[PDB]
């Protein structure tokens, strides 16, 4: 229990550091820019709360012979569409296309959560639904959204592509962790699972945020 608790506290601290840095960076509150900072505060702030809750030993749900971390999935349901929103803003995406990518994202996270909570082998059908919706989300990120980003200045398009790449490459690792970890075949221990996810969560949220902060200043 000590290892898992320690990892969750590290996640909480890293998320808190991001949250404070984004809130501070955003204080200037430029009318067009404010939205991006508030979104980053929401992304890392919600994650921080989730990690604190888990560190305190809340929401460790036993499912068959594994443990499900409910706050992790609730976190993702809330924070991943905020990341997609940030990317859609950057890309200058149209309202229909925003709706599509937010829908596909929500399918991924709901299917992953539901799958984690189903004891039997039918849970892999839920994983599959999420994997299919994720391929759709990736298509949008690398296709239509990238085309949309090209209508922006070269610097904004470069930022879009940088954050798009970070997002696509790291998000693609999560389903493999689900499959190899406790929700799937339970090869990886809960500690190894949590350690990998803490890194990935921190980079996809706080790393993502610092990359945007850097580009915003350099712009």
Ligand X SMILES: CCCCCCCCCCCCCCCCCCCC
Ligand Y SMILES: CC(C)CCC[C@@H](C)CCC[C@@H](C)CCC[C@@H](C)CCOC[C@@H](CO)OCC[C@H](C)CCC[C@H](C)CCC[C@H](C)CCCC(C)C
Decide: 187 and 181 in contact? Cβ < 8 Å: yes
Residue from 24, 119, 176, 189 touching ligand X (CB under 6 A): that is 176
> Positive or negative, the Cα torsion across 92, 97, 98, 104?
negative
- Rounded to the nearest whole angstrom, what is the least distance from the CB of residue 41 to ligand Y in the complex? 6
Binding site for ligand Y (CB under 6 A): 42, 45-46, 49-50, 53, 58-59, 61, 70-71, 74-75, 77-78
Binding mask 45-64 for ligand X (x = CB under 6 A): ----x--xx--x-x------
136 binds, among ligand RET, ligand X, ligand BOG, none (CB under 5 to 8 A by kind): ligand BOG
Q: Which CB sits closer to ligand RET, 148 or 204? A: 204
Calculate the dihedral angle through the C-alpha atoms of 122, 99, 39, 56, rounding to the nearest 10 degrees: -20
Alpha-carbon distance of 186 to 163, in angstroms, equals 31
CA distance linking residue 174 with residue 204, whole number of Å: 11
Query: Binding to ligand RET (CB under 6 A): which residues in 63-102?
Result: 76, 79-80
- Site residues for ligand BOG, 118-177, by CB under 6 A, read 132-133, 135-136, 139, 144
**Cα 110 versus chain centre, distance:** 13
How far is 17 from 174, CA to CA, in rounded Å? 23
**Rounded Cα gap, residues 16 and 10, in angstroms:** 10
The one-character DSSP state at 118 is -
Residue 83 interacting partner from ligand BOG, ligand X, ligand Y, none (CB closer than 5 to 8 Å by kind): none
Nearer to ligand BOG, 110 or 203 (CB): 110
C-beta neighbour count of 126 within 10 angstroms: 19
The separation between CA 118 and the C-alpha centre of its own chain, rounded to angstroms, equals: 22
**Interacting partner of 77 out of ligand Y, ligand X, ligand BOG, none (Cβ under 5 to 8 A depending on kind):** ligand Y
- The residue at minimum Cβ distance from ligand BOG is 136
Q: Would you count residue 173 as binding ligand X (CB under 6 A)?
A: yes
Among 94, 128, 139, 147, which residue sits at the site for ligand X (rule: CB under 6 A)? 128
- Kindly state the smallest distance separating residue 200's Cβ from ligand Y, in Å: 16
Q: Minimum distance from CB of 187 to ligand RET (Å)?
A: 15
Cα(212)–Cα(210) distance, rounded to whole angstroms?
Answer: 5
């Amino acid at each position: 229990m000590v290892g898992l608790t320690t990892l969750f506290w590290l996640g909480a601290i890293g998320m808190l550091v991001g949250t404070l840095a984004f809130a501070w960076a955003g204080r200037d509150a430029g009318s067009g820019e404010r939205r991006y900072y508030v979104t980053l505060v929401g992304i890392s702030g919600i994650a921080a709360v989730a990690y604190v809750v888990m560190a305190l030993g809340v929401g460790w749900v036993p499912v068959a012979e594994r443990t499900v971390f409910a706050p992790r999935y609730i976190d993702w349901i809330l924070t991943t569409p905020l990341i997609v929103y940030f990317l859609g803003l950057l890309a200058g995406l149209d309202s229909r296309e925003f709706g599509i990518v937010i829908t596909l994202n929500t399918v991924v996270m709901l299917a992953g959560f539901a799958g984690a909570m189903v004891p039997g082998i039918e849970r892999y059908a839920l994983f599959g639904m999420g994997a299919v919706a994720f391929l759709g989300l990736v298509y949008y990120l690398v296709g239509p959204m990238t085309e949309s980003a090209s209508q922006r200045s070269s610097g904004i398009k470069s930022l879009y592509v940088r954050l798009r790449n970070l997002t696509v490459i790291l998000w693609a690792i999560y389903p493999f962790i689900w499959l190899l970890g406790p929700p799937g075949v339970a090869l990886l221990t809960p500690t190894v699972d949590v350690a990998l996810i803490v890194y990935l969560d921190l980079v996809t949220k706080v790393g993502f945020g610092f990359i945007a902060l850097d580009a915003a200043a350099t712009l």
